[PDB]
Design a protein around this ligand. Structure first.
Ligand SMILES: *[C@@H]1O[C@H](CO)[C@@H](O[C@@H]2O[C@H](CO)[C@@H](O[C@@H]3O[C@H](CO[C@H]4O[C@H](CO)[C@@H](O)[C@H](O)[C@@H]4O)[C@@H](O)[C@H](O[C@H]4O[C@H](CO)[C@@H](O)[C@H](O)[C@@H]4O[C@H]4O[C@H](CO)[C@@H](O)[C@H](O)[C@@H]4O[C@H]4O[C@H](CO)[C@@H](O)[C@H](O)[C@@H]4O)[C@@H]3O)[C@H](O)[C@H]2NC(C)=O)[C@H](O)[C@H]1NC(C)=O
Ligand SMILES: *[C@@H]1O[C@H](CO)[C@@H](O[C@@H]2O[C@H](CO)[C@@H](O[C@@H]3O[C@H](CO)[C@@H](O)[C@H](O[C@H]4O[C@H](CO)[C@@H](O)[C@H](O)[C@@H]4O)[C@@H]3O)[C@H](O)[C@H]2NC(C)=O)[C@H](O)[C@H]1NC(C)=O
Lengths: 462, 122, 122, 122, 53
């Protein structure tokens, strides 16, 4: 019997391709005012359902490191954030000669912050007035061409100009659901041991992704999701030491940070109408800003990450080392907390090692042991490199706490030599692409092609 | 949405309407979301163009008046329809879809011209 | 545009095409007017989706192969048709339109599959 | 795209599908390009509106149940169709296209109403 | 100088109340109540439609 071509519509057929993507928000921003924050006003309302629609017989490729969605969200966040700072004051009347503090107390036997005073363009243009405020040390630079220490400057005025984040906005990581426009499908990889490349044998589809946390953080991925079964490790290729290596945790290590200086808010005003905020007198006796982690949890989790590294390096044992130097933004763990921008020295979390021997760390014999990290504070955030950088984070009154869960470590295998049989890993820097990519490995968007062609025994009438 | 994916063609022959229906979503935020809201509308009307000009007004199981040249598959109908699933199928026959579209175009237009031979006869 | 509004169903059975035609207007001023210019185009193609998948390619007076379950109205045909006007009818029958859409979907798809049953016989 | 332009009507009766197909192009730069991207999509659906409501679901060579009033041309069929070309023809017949659209509307709607006279008879 | 900053309305613009017709996009209808003593709530018994207000 003869055969005629027959066209089928409504077919499932896929092609991975670039596409614009919605933003959809969860319920915990719709109680605020409009634009406090973007998720309440711009992003479309979500829907909890449908859940992941299981697929009976699928077989799909999943390259994660070339996933375009990171770029489609990197540019999204850069465009969104840089538009959020538009209406606020563009500082500019602060690039002024700061003539300031008296002698430091007891030559650094103190958790110091420096006081400074300066001349401002008051509400009348040509009748300027003197004013006093205080700043944390990283945001002041010596000015004088000589050794003279009397006169100081903001760390800007050499880089681009700045703007003050308005008090209206909030930095809390409101989750964002990504949803593809109609005509595209979000396919979710579900292979529990998926490393990052190759196929996913069990795959599903969803209308919109489950909410991701957009939190900025360099060395530790705060407030993240959890691996369902076990610790897993990812890289584009482990042979390249320069590549970032992500680690994802099953058991969440609990981290708590605080800045117990009872910092107080002050409201200077600049030119017509628009205010500028700065730290006033500290009430109380000053104390260091710090972060706390339970020691037994960290030891057990680091040893378990040791065995997971040994799964790819059974030939060699594992050591951990201090960061790879550089400036402040790259050396230290830096994460946002309630309004401030914490920066924390990470040496005390990366000084252990593992040599095959899993020690009897748990169950707890005495839970009182806790490690401590010394933490500095900043206000002038050179936020992304070459972006229109310096945001001024306003100083927030009252003492703050950011009790949170660690869920992923960004590391780098050392660029050493001498054929060490106990190879060592450092904390990595954080490209925020890499921060966001770690929480987004599960998803891929595919083009739907609902036109079909196949043979069938038909012959239409004439 | 995609329950028919992976399964064989005969099993996939139904729930096509569900696969066709889903081309609607959203609310506007600026130019880029409006760019997403012109959406597959251009794609949807492109498919409508292709299927309508092949004589298939409405989306259905439209068979045609072009014989299936066996060089496109060189595989029997029964082994294919009962066992194969569409993904590697679309990957393979991509070598032939374009000339197939041309043949559908010319066959449908020739048939439509021949309508006048009867439609001017009554 | 709306001459048939208010009047009974039989009187409203004509001038339907006028009410179908009016989906065109405007010139662009910025994003919001362009948002108005994507218009009911999405609504128009949504209606096209619904009525094309129900076999009614080209909007018409389309009757289907689904029997009218009397539980939806429990009213005689003549009393509804000669006397009722559609507004309260749509308000009342809104309790049943969704399952009606499902029934139209399955009935049309089953009928369309039966085209292959007949047309593979020739 | 336009090979049929200039030539006579009969020669231009083919390659119509080519000229109908070409309604797709581009990538977005801002509001004005997006205004170009709503494109003839509104024009395309206007033409779909006109031809679908004239019963011509799926663009074709559609002849209708309205007799050709000779006052529109007062020229023989053969002299027009074999020799004339569509440009000056469109320029001349523009005096009559509007009432022609009205006649097509009423004739098709009357015919569609008469479908119920048979479709309620079976 | 105690409130926000200002701007000068340019001499080019004019403040005369040029009338504005509100018109709904295609697919929607502007319905006009025509009861001569419509108080402001409840029904309007005599009603019309317009393309643009
Ligand atoms: C960060 O650094 C900034 C600077 O870089 C710090 O801010 C500055 O700090 C300065 C030092 O404290 C302060 O200077 C003040 O000057 C006042 C004089 O004001 C003059 O100018 C104004 C403006 O035109 C005039 O109106 C005014 O009449 C003056 O001419 C002083 O009054 C301040 O000192 C008072 O407090 C100290 C204690 O700390 C006392 O020793 C001193 O005597 C003053 O107290 C008397 O006066 C108050 C009223 O002001 C009376 O109520 C009180 O009872 C005292 O009375 C004396 O006299 C009576 C008899 O009259 C007598 O019986 C009694 O026993 C007392 O002796 C102060 O010196 C700057 O103003 C300030 N900058 C600004 C912008 O305000 C900032 O603190 C630093 N912050 C941190 C955290 O480090
Ligand atoms: C500013 O700094 C102060 C001082 O450091 C800080 O106050 C302290 O906060 C801790 C946070 O954990 C409090 O810890 C307690 O921990 C016990 C467990 O042993 C909990 O049971 C307590 O909470 C429950 O019980 C309370 C009644 O006992 C309830 O009132 C409460 O709502 C909970 O149900 C409690 O969290 C600690 O008690 C306080 N106070 C002191 C003196 O340490 C404060 O939180 C900091 N400010 C901010 C904004 O964080």
């Amino acid at each position: 019997e003869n055969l005629w071509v027959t066209v089928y519509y409504g077919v499932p057929v896929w092609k991975e391709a670039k596409t614009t993507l919605f933003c959809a928000s969860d319920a915990r921003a719709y109680e605020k005012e409009v634009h406090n924050v973007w998720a309440t006003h711009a992003c479309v309302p979500t829907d909890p359902s449908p859940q992941e629609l299981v697929l009976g017989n699928v077989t799909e490729n999943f390259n994660m490191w070339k996933n375009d969605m990171v770029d489609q969200m990197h540019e999204d966040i850069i465009s969104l954030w840089d538009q959020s700072l538009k209406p606020c004051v563009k500082l500019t009347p602060l690039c002024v000669t700061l003539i300031c503090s008296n002698a430091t107390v007891k030559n650094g036997t103190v958790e110091e912050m420096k006081n400074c005073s300066f001349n401002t363009t008051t509400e009348i243009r040509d009748k300027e007035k003197k004013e006093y405020a205080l700043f944390y040390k990283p945001d002041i630079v010596p000015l004088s061409e000589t050794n003279n220490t009397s006169e100081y400057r903001l760390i800007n005025c050499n880089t681009s100009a700045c703007t003050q984040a308005c008090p209206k906005v909030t930095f809390e990581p409101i989750p964002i659901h990504y949803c593809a426009p109609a005509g595209y499908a979000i396919l979710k990889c579900n292979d529990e041991t998926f490393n990052g490349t190759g196929p996913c044998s069990n795959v599903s589809t969803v209308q919109c992704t489950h909410g991701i946390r957009p939190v900025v953080s360099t060395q530790l991925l705060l407030n993240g999701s959890l691996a369902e079964k076990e610790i897993v490790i990812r890289s584009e290729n482990l042979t390249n030491n320069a590549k970032i290596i992500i680690v994802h945790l099953h058991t969440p290590v609990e981290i708590v940070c605080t800045r117990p200086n009872n910092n107080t808010r002050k409201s200077v005003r600049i030119g017509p109408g628009q205010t500028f905020y700065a730290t006033g007198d500290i009430i109380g006796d000053i104390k260091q800003a710090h972060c706390n982690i339970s020691e037994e949890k960290w030891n057990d989790t680091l040893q378990k990450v040791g065995i997971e590294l040994q799964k790819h390096f059974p030939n060699k044992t594992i050591k951990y080392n201090q960061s790879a130097g550089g400036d402040m933004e790259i050396t230290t763990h830096s994460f946002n907390c309630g309004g401030e921008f914490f920066y924390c020295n990470t040496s005390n979390l990366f000084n252990g090692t593992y040599n095959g021997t899993y020690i009897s760390t748990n169950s707890s014999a005495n839970s009182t042991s806790t490690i401590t990290l010394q933490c500095r504070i900043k206000q002038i955030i050179n936020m992304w490199q070459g972006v229109g950088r310096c945001m001024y984070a306003p100083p927030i009154a009252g003492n703050i706490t950011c009790r949170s869960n660690i869920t992923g470590l960004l590391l780098t295998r050392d660029g050493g030599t001498n054929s060490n049989e106990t190879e060592t890993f450092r904390p990595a820097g954080g490209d925020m692409r890499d921060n966001w990519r770690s929480e987004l490995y599960k998803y891929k968007v595919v083009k739907i092609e609902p036109l079909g062609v196949a043979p069938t025994r038909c012959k239409r009438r004439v | 949405f995609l329950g028919a994916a992976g399964s064989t063609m005969g099993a996939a022959s139904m729930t096509l309407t569900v696969q066709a229906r889903n081309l609607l979503s959203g609310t506007v935020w600026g130019i880029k979301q409006l760019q997403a809201r012109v959406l597959a509308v251009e794609r949807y009307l492109r498919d409508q163009q292709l299927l309508g000009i092949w004589g298939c007004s409405g989306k259905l199981i439209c068979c045609t008046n072009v014989p299936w040249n066996s060089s496109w598959s060189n595989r029997n109908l029964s082994e294919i329809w009962d066992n194969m699933t569409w993904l590697q199928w679309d990957k393979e026959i991509s070598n032939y879809t374009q000339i197939i579209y041309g043949l559908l175009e010319e066959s449908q237009n020739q048939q439509e011209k021949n309508e006048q031979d009867l439609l001017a006869l009554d």
